[PDB]
Structures are given as structure tokens and as C-alpha cells.
Amino acid sequence: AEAGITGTWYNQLGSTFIVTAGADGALTGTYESAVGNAESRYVLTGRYDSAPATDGSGTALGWTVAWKNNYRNAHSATTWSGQYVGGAEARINTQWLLTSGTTEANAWKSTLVGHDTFTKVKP
Template identity: 45%
Template structure:
């Protein structure tokens, strides 16, 4: 059920290989940022689904952005649920944390949070552009605060 290729709303691709012991291995290719080439992923999933067919199956994995092309000095984790709709459509709905390497004084600013939905179908260029405009282009909160005008 989890095995195979998945795409998120920004066009990033992952290949999941579930193991008998609830382990996950695979590959992740990011469509955003400065990530080059393919990165190894590792994770876990609940291999004993809930009795309720509408309930999701818990899943989580981690990717450290280091390969032969680049060491970005950051690690991302995804945690979420795998769902199958009544029509058989599969999706993985997740929240992610991306931790960047920083100096101790900047640790408070070193982690980003977001969400991804993975499906079996690669999104169209128009859908990727829309998702990109809604998420990737968001300003950093410090930039918003710096440019805020005082209320009268």
C-alpha cells in the first residue's frame, strides 16, 4: 500500500520501500530550495491499521540533505497519515519540520514548519505554480514585522 512513487503539491518526488518490520526506506528528490539530486529517506509506519476504515495509518520519515552533490546542513522530518478514500484514491497527509544548521544564537530561527500532501499522481505545472505561490513565496515573519507600519 505505501510502496512506490509519491509526489507532493510542489512536485517533489519520493519513492517508499516498506519493510516487514514497519520500517521505511527510500529516496527523496526535492523540487524546491537548493537541494540537488536524490537523498536517502528512512522512517517508520504503523503496520497494524485501525479497525475504522476511514482512519489513517500513521507514518513518518526523515531526510538529511546530504549527498554526493551537496551538503545543505539541514534535516527534514515528516509525520502524518496514509489514507485511502472510498474510491481507492491514496494520499499521505503530513506536517514537516526542516531544521537548518545555525550558530547557537540563531537556534530560535533554525526550524521551519509546513505541510505536504503526497499522491500517486505528479501535479500539473499549473498546480505546482499555484502551490508554489501559496507557500514557498511567503515572507519570513521577521521581514513582515520589520516592514509593519504602526497603527494610528
Template identity: 40%
Template sequence: MRMHLGICILVLVLGAVPVEPLPRSARATSCNSHNTQNQCAIAGIWRNQLLSEMTLTCQNGTLSGHYYSAVGNAEKEYDLIGRYVQVNSTEYIVGWSVAYKNQYRNARSVASWTGVYYATHGNIKTHWILASYVDPDNYQKTFNTNQDQFHKIGDLPCTQGVVG
């Protein structure tokens, strides 16, 4: 699956790069209600308005999973780590980060999202900031920021590995 980072400016800055989606067969059976790694309503597979996708598991205030960027200088999946706070019985404040370095590419950048899961709307509304390495003479070009809105598109497959 794929997820997008942000806005057209980000696409222009980094350039669009296609990524491989998760195999659809991996989503065949849901484990959200039976997996102890998924203790909150935000566990699952999410997609934003630019078609970037992420998987989230949650346990004891910690988010973990993978991010698949549909934009920018990204290739394949990247690890995601973050925290959540339960506001009431169904809603959460969330924050997570992705370092864009994996076995395929080092994009020399890190993105962080912070936002709110609204159960009544079924989405996570976020603000993000992307920091990319540039030489010191161009420091003003280091940061990009905008908003994303994620919608849940599925539950986690039973084959999803448990993240410690």
C-alpha cells in the same frame, strides 16, 4: 522525479533549486505486488503539491527509499528512512526523515514528516519540520514547519534496489 518540501516560506528561505527526475524508463514495469520489500499499500512513487517526489518501500514496519526535493538547497536524491504502523487493513500512520547530505551537496539540514495514509482518499497527509544549521546567534531561524500532501503517481520499478 522531484518532490517539494513545503511552502513558499521554505522556498524563500532556501531558494528553488531544480533536481533531476528519475528516468521514466525506470518506471516501465511495476514490482510492487511481487517484491517482498513492499508489504504495504504505501509502497510506490509519491508527489506532493510542490512537485517534490519520493520512492517508498516498506517491510516489517520500516520505510525506506529516496527523496527528490524540488525546492530548497537540495541536489539530486537523498536517502529516506522511517517507520509505519498499520491502523486497519488499508490505512497507516507514517513518519520518515531525510538528511540533506549526499555526494553532491551538504545542505546542513534535516527534514522529518509524520502523517496518515488515507486509503479512501489515496493520499498521505503530513506535517513536516525542517531543521537547518545556523550560527548560535540566529538560533530562532533554525526551524521551519508546515504541511504536505502526497499523491501516489506510480508503482516502484523492477529495477529499484532492495533496501535492507
């Protein structure tokens, strides 16, 4: 749900995710990673599927962060695809793809894959 997704979230690495879900299915916010060639905050944009189902199904969503800001440019972007499960203890379970810009010759090693789980902080 938008209200349920809106908030500050942290993942197992200690990275911060601040987001707002709009009525139109949009997601906008900032991301701060605890690891990598990153520093300070980066802008994120994504979408969620606003009308999930009733049932105890998660809401699918995804978002992107290009790792460039006024302090660093890592020439890479990460996308997170996963689901939001609300409740007392709401979580966002995801899998992600991190692509670095390479020459055609090294494209075979441009993408990393992983999974992150986010926990919402009160408020």
C-alpha cells in the same frame, strides 16, 4: 499497509518520494525536492505504525531526509509526520519540520514548518 504505502508519490511542489514499506514497520527510499538547496536524490528512512486499526482510520507514519548527498550539503534535515489513507485515491497527508544547523545565537530561527500532501502514481 506496506503494499499500499510502497510506490512513487509526488506532492504539490512537484517533489518525488519513492518508498518501500517492510513487514517490520520500516520505510526506506529516496526523495527528490523540487525546491530548496537540494539537487538529485537523498536517502530517507522512517517507520509506520504496520498494524493500523479497521476502521476508516489512517495509518500513522513519519520519515527523515538529511539534505546531504554527493553533490550538495545543505546542513539541514526535514522530518515529515502524517497519515496514509489508502483507497482508489490514496494520499499521505503530512506536516513537516525543516531544521538547519545554526550557531546558538541564531537557533531561535533554525526551524521551518509546513505541510505537504502526496499523491500516489500508478503502479
